[PDB]
Amino acid sequence: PAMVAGIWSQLEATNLLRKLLSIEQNPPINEVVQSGVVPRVVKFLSRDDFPKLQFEAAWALTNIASGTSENTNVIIESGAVPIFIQLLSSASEDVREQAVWALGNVAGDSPKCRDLVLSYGAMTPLLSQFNENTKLSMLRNATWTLSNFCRGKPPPAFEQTQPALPVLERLVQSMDEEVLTDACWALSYLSDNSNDKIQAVIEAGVVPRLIQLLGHSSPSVLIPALRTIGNIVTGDDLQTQMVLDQQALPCLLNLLKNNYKKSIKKEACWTISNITAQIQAVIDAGIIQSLVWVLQSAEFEVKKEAAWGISNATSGHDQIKFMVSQGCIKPLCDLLTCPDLKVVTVCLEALENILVVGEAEKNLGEDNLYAQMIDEAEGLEKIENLQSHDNNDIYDKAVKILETFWT
């Protein structure tokens, strides 16, 4: 409005500058760059002797880091990021926490910013920061900044984030919901797309704790923990087995059985489908009833995942007979009229696998029971209608099912 930048005690000015930037609506950031006093403020970061000015300066730049990637990039070009790194070793507790904050804002903005922060080796001082003497405010701030250090896609070089795993393992032991949430998010990022990464996460010994978090009374914690476990099962079988051996399935059942948040149910189904690829384990837990219940009653985003869970099991003989005895056919049949072609093909794949086992056990004088059951559930009509379908791939899949099991 009518500011005088008397920064050239000027702390008084730096405080106003900082407070102006921390305005909620229309923060006047770009006009601070017009005046061009950012390098002067960057010099104040290097004033260990006068930590109030240092604190108000760091805060003022943390605020500029918030928002858009530019004007975020001007803080990078000013050379403030390296200064924030060595501020993590300052004697002032308020400066250290502020330095942690600033680096979180920056790293979180983009993978380019993240990698830049990691290239300067911000990890090492950020970890030498968690201990018994660490307060709640610092504990929360640091775990969150760490969350952003691992966040983003493309992901950061695994081996840069790898030493976080030892610390993360301890952070999940906490009972603070803000710390637990971000820790699980951090872990969920470190398990995405690479069996090598998934293995490292298991070796840290976080799996048993994450199971307990599946029974947590707060979706903030429940979701990222459930996501991490979902990522662990997407890897190979020996990795998937480690979650099974930790009795994760009773916890997953609860999420389907009890009426949790719509999005949590669908994450649980997604996780179950990545197991069915060790199918024996899921059957013993009694998941199929609730999974069939979901496949009929629950809304489409969850049905889609349930369908995947069923089909993948039928891909991986005696087991299928139990699934049919749970009344899974009718559920699968009525989804053949679905608008989504991906789930229609998934259901065809499922019924085909069932019909194969139907023919198999028939040859042991009777008919194919499952083909009869499909016909009994109005399923044969729906399959015959797929011959008039737009998608050629579905016509083809529909025809080959008829020619093999109905002539």
Numbering used by the authors: 78 to 85, 91 to 359, 364 to 402, 405 to 452, 456 to 498
Reproduce, without paraphrasing, sentences from the article in which this PDB structure was first reported.
The importin-α armadillo repeat domain binds to nuclear localization sequences (NLSs) of cargo proteins whilst an N-terminal α-helix makes direct contact to importin-β and is therefore called the importin-β-binding (IBB) domain (Cook et al., 2007). The importin-α armadillo repeats form two NLS-binding sites on the concave side of the protein, referred to as ‘major’ and ‘minor’ binding site. Whereas bipartite NLSs make contact to both binding sites, monopartite NLSs bind to either the major or the minor site (Marfori et al., 2011; Chang et al., 2013).
A crystal structure of the MOS6 armadillo repeat domain suggests strong conservation of the NLS-binding sites between MOS6 and four other Arabidopsis importin-αs. We attempted to crystallize ΔIBBMOS6 in complex with either HaRxL106 or an HaRxL106 peptide containing the NLS, but we did not obtain protein crystals of sufficient quality for structure determination. Like other importin-α proteins from yeast, mammals and rice, ΔIBBMOS6 forms 10 armadillo repeats with strong conservation of residues that contribute to the major and minor NLS-binding sites (Marfori et al., 2011). We superposed the ΔIBBMOS6 structure onto the structure of rice importin-α1a in complex with a SV40NLS (Chang et al., 2012). This revealed that essentially all amino acids of rice importin-α1a, that make direct contact to the SV40NLS at the major and minor NLS-binding sites, are conserved in MOS6. We determined the conservation of the NLS-binding sites of importin-αs expressed in rosette leaves by homology modelling based on the ΔIBBMOS6 structure. However, when only the H3 helices of ARM repeats 1–8 that contribute the NLS-binding sites are considered, the sequence identity is approximately 45% (Wirthmueller et al., 2013). This conservation of the H3 helices allowed us to build homology models for the armadillo repeat domains of other Arabidopsis importin-αs based on the ΔIBBMOS6 structure. Superposition of individual models with the ΔIBBMOS6 structure revealed an almost complete conservation of the major and minor NLS-binding sites in five out of six importin-αs expressed in rosette leaves (importin-α1, -α2, -α3, -α4 and -α6).
